[PDB]
Enzyme design. Sequence first.
Site, short mmCIF file in Angstrom:
data_model
loop_
_atom_site.label_atom_id
_atom_site.label_comp_id
_atom_site.label_asym_id
_atom_site.label_seq_id
_atom_site.Cartn_x
_atom_site.Cartn_y
_atom_site.Cartn_z
N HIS A 61 -15.96 -10.95 71.35
CA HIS A 61 -16.58 -11.92 72.25
C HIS A 61 -17.77 -11.31 72.97
O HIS A 61 -18.02 -11.59 74.15
CB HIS A 61 -15.57 -12.46 73.26
C1 FAD Z 1 -12.27 -13.05 64.48
C2 FAD Z 1 -12.96 -13.76 65.61
C3 FAD Z 1 -12.26 -14.69 66.37
C4 FAD Z 1 -12.87 -15.36 67.43
N1 FAD Z 1 -12.13 -16.28 68.16
C5 FAD Z 1 -12.72 -16.90 69.14
C6 FAD Z 1 -11.95 -17.86 69.91
O1 FAD Z 1 -10.77 -18.15 69.72
N2 FAD Z 1 -12.66 -18.46 70.92
C7 FAD Z 1 -13.98 -18.23 71.24
O2 FAD Z 1 -14.49 -18.85 72.18
N3 FAD Z 1 -14.70 -17.32 70.52
C8 FAD Z 1 -14.10 -16.70 69.52
N4 FAD Z 1 -14.82 -15.80 68.78
C9 FAD Z 1 -16.22 -15.55 69.14
C10 FAD Z 1 -17.16 -16.66 68.69
O3 FAD Z 1 -17.06 -16.86 67.28
C11 FAD Z 1 -18.60 -16.28 69.05
O4 FAD Z 1 -18.58 -15.06 69.79
C12 FAD Z 1 -19.35 -17.33 69.85
O5 FAD Z 1 -19.76 -18.39 68.98
C13 FAD Z 1 -20.54 -16.76 70.59
O6 FAD Z 1 -21.43 -16.14 69.65
P1 FAD Z 1 -22.65 -16.93 69.02
O7 FAD Z 1 -22.11 -18.11 68.21
O8 FAD Z 1 -23.63 -17.28 70.07
O9 FAD Z 1 -23.28 -15.90 68.00
P2 FAD Z 1 -23.86 -16.34 66.60
O10 FAD Z 1 -24.61 -17.61 66.73
O11 FAD Z 1 -22.68 -16.39 65.62
O12 FAD Z 1 -24.80 -15.14 66.20
C14 FAD Z 1 -25.20 -14.92 64.83
C15 FAD Z 1 -26.05 -16.08 64.36
O13 FAD Z 1 -27.45 -15.73 64.49
C16 FAD Z 1 -28.08 -15.77 63.22
N5 FAD Z 1 -29.03 -14.67 63.14
C17 FAD Z 1 -28.92 -13.44 63.73
N6 FAD Z 1 -29.93 -12.64 63.49
C18 FAD Z 1 -30.77 -13.40 62.68
C19 FAD Z 1 -32.01 -13.13 62.08
N7 FAD Z 1 -32.66 -11.97 62.20
N8 FAD Z 1 -32.57 -14.11 61.34
C20 FAD Z 1 -31.93 -15.27 61.21
N9 FAD Z 1 -30.76 -15.64 61.73
C21 FAD Z 1 -30.22 -14.65 62.46
C22 FAD Z 1 -26.96 -15.71 62.18
O14 FAD Z 1 -27.36 -16.35 60.98
C23 FAD Z 1 -25.85 -16.49 62.90
O15 FAD Z 1 -26.01 -17.89 62.75
C24 FAD Z 1 -14.22 -15.10 67.72
C25 FAD Z 1 -14.93 -14.17 66.96
C26 FAD Z 1 -14.31 -13.50 65.91
C27 FAD Z 1 -15.10 -12.51 65.10
#
Ligand code: FAD
EC number: 1.-.-.-
Lengths: 649, 649
Positions: free
Chosen positions: A575
């Site tokens: 997270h």
């Molecule tokens: C096993 C696991 C279980 C989880 N369980 C939970 C849960 O129960 N509840 C919860 O709230 N969270 C949970 N999480 C966390 C959750 O999935 C994310 O942490 C949350 O969505 C916040 O991250 P984010 O989506 O903003 O990051 P993301 O949006 O996922 O960051 C990566 C994204 O950016 C893009 N990207 C990055 N660099 C580039 C680049 N250079 N060029 C183009 N695209 C790029 C990728 O394509 C991708 O779409 C879990 C995570 C894991 C790994």
Amino acid sequence: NLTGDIVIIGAGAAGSLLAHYLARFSNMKIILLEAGHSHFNDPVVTDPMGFFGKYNPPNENISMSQNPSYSWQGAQEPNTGAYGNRPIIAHGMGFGGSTMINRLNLVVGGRTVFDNDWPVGWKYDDVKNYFRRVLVDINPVRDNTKASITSVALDALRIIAEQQIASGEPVDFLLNKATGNVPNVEKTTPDAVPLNLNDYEGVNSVVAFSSFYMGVNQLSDGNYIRKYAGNTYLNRNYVDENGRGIGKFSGLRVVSDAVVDRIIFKGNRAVGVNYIDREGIMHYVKVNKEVVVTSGAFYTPTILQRSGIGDFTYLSSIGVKNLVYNNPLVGTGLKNHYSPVTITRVHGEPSEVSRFLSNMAANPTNMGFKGLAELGFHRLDPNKPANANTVTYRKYQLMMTAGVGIPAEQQYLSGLSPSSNNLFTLIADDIRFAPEGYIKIGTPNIPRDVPKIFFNTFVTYTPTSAPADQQWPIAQKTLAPLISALLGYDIIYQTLISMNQTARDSGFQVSLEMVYPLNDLIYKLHNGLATYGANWWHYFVPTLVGDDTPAGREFADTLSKLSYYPRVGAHLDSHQGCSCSIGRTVDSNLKVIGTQNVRVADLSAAAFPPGGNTWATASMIGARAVDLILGFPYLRDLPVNDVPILNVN
Amino acid sequence: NLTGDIVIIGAGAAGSLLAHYLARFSNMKIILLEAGHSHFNDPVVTDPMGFFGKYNPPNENISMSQNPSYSWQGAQEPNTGAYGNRPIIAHGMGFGGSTMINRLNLVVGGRTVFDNDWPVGWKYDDVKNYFRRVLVDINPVRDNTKASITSVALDALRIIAEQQIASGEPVDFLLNKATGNVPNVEKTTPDAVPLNLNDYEGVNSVVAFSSFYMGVNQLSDGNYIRKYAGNTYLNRNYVDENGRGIGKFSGLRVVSDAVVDRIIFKGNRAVGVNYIDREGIMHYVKVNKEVVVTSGAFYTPTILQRSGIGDFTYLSSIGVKNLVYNNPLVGTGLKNHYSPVTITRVHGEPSEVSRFLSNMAANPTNMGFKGLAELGFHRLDPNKPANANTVTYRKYQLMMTAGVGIPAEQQYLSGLSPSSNNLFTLIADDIRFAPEGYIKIGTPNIPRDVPKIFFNTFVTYTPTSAPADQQWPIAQKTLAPLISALLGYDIIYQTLISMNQTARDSGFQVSLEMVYPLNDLIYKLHNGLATYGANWWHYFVPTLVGDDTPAGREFADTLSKLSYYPRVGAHLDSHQGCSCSIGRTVDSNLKVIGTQNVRVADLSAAAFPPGGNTWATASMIGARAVDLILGFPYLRDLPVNDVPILNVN
Ligand SMILES: Cc1cc2nc3c(=O)[nH]c(=O)nc-3n(C[C@H](O)[C@H](O)[C@H](O)COP(=O)(O)OP(=O)(O)OC[C@H]3O[C@@H](n4cnc5c(N)ncnc54)[C@H](O)[C@@H]3O)c2cc1C
Ligand SMILES: Cc1cc2nc3c(=O)[nH]c(=O)nc-3n(C[C@H](O)[C@H](O)[C@H](O)COP(=O)(O)OP(=O)(O)OC[C@H]3O[C@@H](n4cnc5c(N)ncnc54)[C@H](O)[C@@H]3O)c2cc1C
């Protein structure tokens, strides 16, 4: 060629929502570049049991998070505070970001976590509508199969809560001030009112409930599906296989499998971004008005620094030819949680122990997340906010699980073979985790999966030849994570003894005791807490206190011996976020300081992690950014009865 | 080209009446499209014995319902509750709909079935005139050849009824509250007053009579004819071979052999419908004011969903390009009956057994439907309405038949060869059948005879490791159809023992006993009912009750053994309907929710099936729709002495 008024980088948890509500609510041309591709017809993703590996090939049986074709592989540096190991954390690559590989649990965070730690113009009363919008758009569902263990646990926490209320202590972990004298716990009656931990008014800070809200749905067939950003905001109803919008979303033009390594600048404003297609050849994208970056927690610092914005001394040491702006804060101050785990075994007749754990199997409607409560502060916690006597915070999240979720080496060492069917799992984790890290790039050429990631969680304290009372605050500040972990263990012990008495009362003639943490140590820790009090952690440093009494030296040995569990007997929760918090890298408008036309609108731009799982935080950020960039509260006013039409395709 | 103020889809049981009374009572241009064609000069249809195959070719000797040139072939999915078989049900194609292939029996339904289950503005006092209009327009006739068995049966039911009246129980199956203390049974006197089961005031809910009212007539020659919607409402007196009205019906323009696959929309209103002619080429029909759909039970959900109205998720999964409105209720909640059958054999001297069954042959004035009564509730029925102590309902319909009507495999297994001339048939069926189904299309291109038709009738109950009293209501709700079938068997047994004693009293020295259901099982069931009482069905789940006594385990074995009859020893009655009940898909005006100018006016728009055979229900619906769409009670006020002139051509 390929111009765009607004350019969005990555279709993460906030990128898809941003692109949708930006193309629909305006008339400008919007183009989105994403490194991943759609997985709408991939059985591993849609089926909730795909998380456990129901579709893996026989010779490549690996997890979806460990597959480099689904996620980034962020291998970390050796950890001084974790016995010199290198765990690997991942970010989901594709539409929806990390929501394709998570365990589908939604938490809003609470009221105090936004009221206190967040800057002005960002409190809960300003993001309530965005949070409600996100929640109704996802439209989650609770658990369907109810078990007997949950009612017994609920009544146990109710007894503990009423005892603590009658105690009169300032703050504890079953005290909800906004509720009142009545304990904030669900009812064990079969016809009880389902209590919600995501109340719209934020009246539930610490409270015991019966289930969370999974991001799943039930279909007409009977099959369960995974609900996440990709299949909620960017379905086939809006974007075709050619990546073009249809209808009022025709201004959007999304490009898949497009990773952008650098944002080109004219000195203080962005003019274009470049990417590499699946042919392996480069491409140029021209930016008209602003650039939007949604690259996620671990990878927005890298794209910011490599593009020329960051510490000029270290960037020059690396070899960045083009330099833009100098901050010593780019990439610093990120946060992540940590989930210590415990295992409880029931001893008794085979029939009673088989009946006691009824309705526990992994189901797509719960994924083993029965859950108990979002617990709060301990009575013996030294590191508490100064105004704790005025408001109630969130510190723990108690959730029950079936089986024995523990690394295999520890399973063999402790002897908790999964073949045993008289044990279960409950998890207490820290949501306000103290230790901090930093991310630095090593090559200013392309975004790599492995940057310099230093994260030391449970560090020790080395006493010095100085007065003890002069150095004690330093030790208290340093030793916070171990204190929190052991307090969580004590909370679990109190919950467990209440469980034992309540279960003996409820007709089941069984006993539940801790086995995994070598119960001798836990019982000695409880006795030491009771006999010592607020200065229990003073013996974490044996030679500094210098008691040198058999009880004191035995407690020092116990504290040194029990510190191995929080370090090794768990797995790190993924997270991570807040690496570019507001004020450090961006202002209150999510715009970069010193730059003119670049904006970042994901979890990386969060001041402090929420008091819960951070699924809704990123999307919410995007939602807020939608009306910040458009200029009017278009999205926040839309009625509650408007959700994008869900297409399975 | 080919415009029309009102467009009617299908000349079903209600389509012909709607077209007639709409063209006559207004001045707008009306056009009707029907998939079938007129069969006014087809000896198979007009001759009542054509139902038994008196005109079949030697090498194509199949039933009229199994002929795909006469009816739709609605093959159903494998049935979990019916031992994994795929029975096929049919809808008559042509003028009059399914009234061309039925057995020509008319029932009105009763008073309570419309008073309780139907919404406001739809009770019996509002549809009485429409029902009377329909009945007098059909003008049915009773049976002409009276038999000795019927009087003996009538006196037997009279004795049982007076015993039950003297008993004082709350509700039974020979208790008519609206009549009083005198039993509601016909008199065995040769000069008895013919009692009617279709009384205009609805005073006869459960009552024993001597005959129904067939939809037949006697001609001057002496030949019998079939009376149905086609030869009652759309004869040669109104429409010629060119499909054009004459006289005051000249506004009507009917087209035969025209199936419509889709209704074209302008977003919320219908503008035209398209069909395919006998050339195999398409055609366009333009709609002016409203569209009327009369496609029958199984096929209005398909035409509604394929045209763009229905569950958008599943429609999108199928591939419907144009979408109109989203309901999760289109096609759900349909009902149909089920007719368990029993066979009774008489043992005695050949002359007495030959004389006992006199006047039983299949005749066009009765078609073997001598009939006994429309029976009600059992004394041991757990699933009864809460207000049963205030009103009397209809649950069973007892009818006598000659021969042995049973599938051939069961005839060979049980040994009831039709060569035996000392046996007859009596049928008790459920009119309030519990199990429910659903219809979903599989291709959004053309109406096909085989959509996804899931119908499980007699499902079992799987006990769980839960408290018995906690789960017992679920089992009681699930096990309703088996309970009803066995209660019907017990009712038949009581009627049979009364038959035996009364026949021995009436001078015939014979005995009548059940042979088909393996009378050992029926007698054991009666003994178990008597010795157990209201909790007789608790042993349907053997391990849940856990009696484990020789009598208890023997009764469990008997209940498991006797459940095969209701599943296999019968054939499904083709009275399906109510798939688009009022409130689910249409309002109280039979107009579609959210749409502007489409109306559906057949049995598919019925809230709940009537307490009897549903011939008059569809037509009645149409009748009501006539004055709903015109706006004045024109049809309902017309005097009783007005019937369309019957033309044989
Ligand atoms: C096993 C696991 C279980 C989880 N369980 C939970 C849960 O129960 N509840 C919860 O709230 N969270 C949970 N999480 C966390 C959750 O999935 C994310 O942490 C949350 O969505 C916040 O991250 P984010 O989506 O903003 O990051 P993301 O949006 O996922 O960051 C990566 C994204 O950016 C893009 N990207 C990055 N660099 C580039 C680049 N250079 N060029 C183009 N695209 C790029 C990728 O394509 C991708 O779409 C879990 C995570 C894991 C790994
Ligand atoms: C063997 C048998 C015996 C029966 N006995 C009795 C009995 O004794 N008593 C009783 O009350 N009922 C009986 N029924 C039932 C009765 O015949 C009907 O169920 C009743 O008329 C109600 O159905 P319906 O007429 O509204 O359906 P129908 O009107 O028959 O439905 C089909 C009609 O819709 C038309 N249609 C459908 N789709 C389209 C399309 N796409 N385009 C154009 N036209 C279309 C067809 O041409 C046809 O006219 C019996 C049925 C069967 C099969």
